[PDB]
Ligand binder design. Sequence first.
Ligand SMILES: *SC[C@H](NC(=O)CC[C@H](N)C(=O)O)C(=O)NCC(=O)O
Ligand SMILES: *SC[C@H](NC(=O)CC[C@H](N)C(=O)O)C(=O)NCC(=O)O
Lengths: 201, 201
Amino acid sequence: MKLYYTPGSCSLSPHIVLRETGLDFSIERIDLRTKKTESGKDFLAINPKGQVPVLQLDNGDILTEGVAIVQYLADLKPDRNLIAPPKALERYHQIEWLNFLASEVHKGYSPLFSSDTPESYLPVVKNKLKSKFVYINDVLSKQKCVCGDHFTVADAYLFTLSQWAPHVALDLTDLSHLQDYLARIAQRPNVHSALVTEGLI
Amino acid sequence: MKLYYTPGSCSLSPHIVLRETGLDFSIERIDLRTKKTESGKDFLAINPKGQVPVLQLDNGDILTEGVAIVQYLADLKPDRNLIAPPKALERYHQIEWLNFLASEVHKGYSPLFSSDTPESYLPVVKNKLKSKFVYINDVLSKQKCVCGDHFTVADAYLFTLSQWAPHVALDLTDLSHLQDYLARIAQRPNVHSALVTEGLI
Ligand SMILES: *SC[C@H](NC(=O)CC[C@H](N)C(=O)O)C(=O)NCC(=O)O
Ligand SMILES: *SC[C@H](NC(=O)CC[C@H](N)C(=O)O)C(=O)NCC(=O)O
């Protein structure tokens, strides 16, 4: 099981999940500029969409899209409780949150990382994004995690998306519930070890 | 089971799926401008995020996010084959496509429907979007549907997202594989009947 990643990218989410499940895996750094693996192979041949994360299964199959990857992983180790059982109501609310984070938050960052974005539009984009974290902050005021009382794959995803905030000058320091939650998630051995292995920390 | 929708919106996807599964449901039109149901109730009390689709379950629970809604629906009628069984490999590739459509295509339209978007940025956004459909078109050249040989919930979603193309002057007429696929999907009784019931056709 190999994970194609780029340090500090959205591939940190499946990286955290891989450690939290205790599965046997290997990672391979991808260079998003040249689209080449650290071993010199063409990454477009692996994933035509040219992005990370990408999970290579032991049988050879390739899986793209982070939300699909973390569900496949968590489903392999039911006993970890990183996702609810299939067909359970709690599972659909998790899927619901994974989609909210992928389309509203994750994709909300995109224009802030693009060079072709009008400097006059940046303020507008940043505000749309903060309104998203404000919603998340309100939710974290009556519960310990985004989907409930325990740590799930959606939490791994949110910690990852929160990390970028400083790099694009998005202020989230007024969101104390979110700030306390981030601090907690960061002291988890499996999360901390993921950051170390990637060169952050 | 009630579906909160707006004619021709992204809520057409779960609408098509509800008919394809043959479940007992009702629909209620939402006014996105005033955020009020057609029965005069405050929609923000139902869905704080203020968007459609929204599915009200018989037990009272509320489900948001289209990708979560269509999975919950299809999972209720395994025999229809609108999604693969949970934990099956085919299921994760479907989840993978549902995420691609939600974050890369669906969210890719967003700036084209916003009034606060610089007219100079529109060309850039449109091109990013077409590159997405070009990828989808290539895929449809060696298979009948987006995820395989049969009709799944991801197909209901793509037909829905393709419908908007003309309204934002996005040309997809050079994508013959996509054009033939759309024509096929449209002649399905359950899809056709969804369009009629919504005022399109
Ligand atoms: S975070 C790094 C970028 N990945 C994605 O945007 C993944 C999007 C998928 N829809 C998903 O996994 O959810 C990335 O690798 N971008 C490539 C680049 O060239 O910047
Ligand atoms: S398509 C109509 C709009 N819905 C969404 O954007 C849903 C986004 C979710 N992430 C999802 O369901 O996938 C909508 O209702 N917009 C509200 C408005 O005021 O325009």
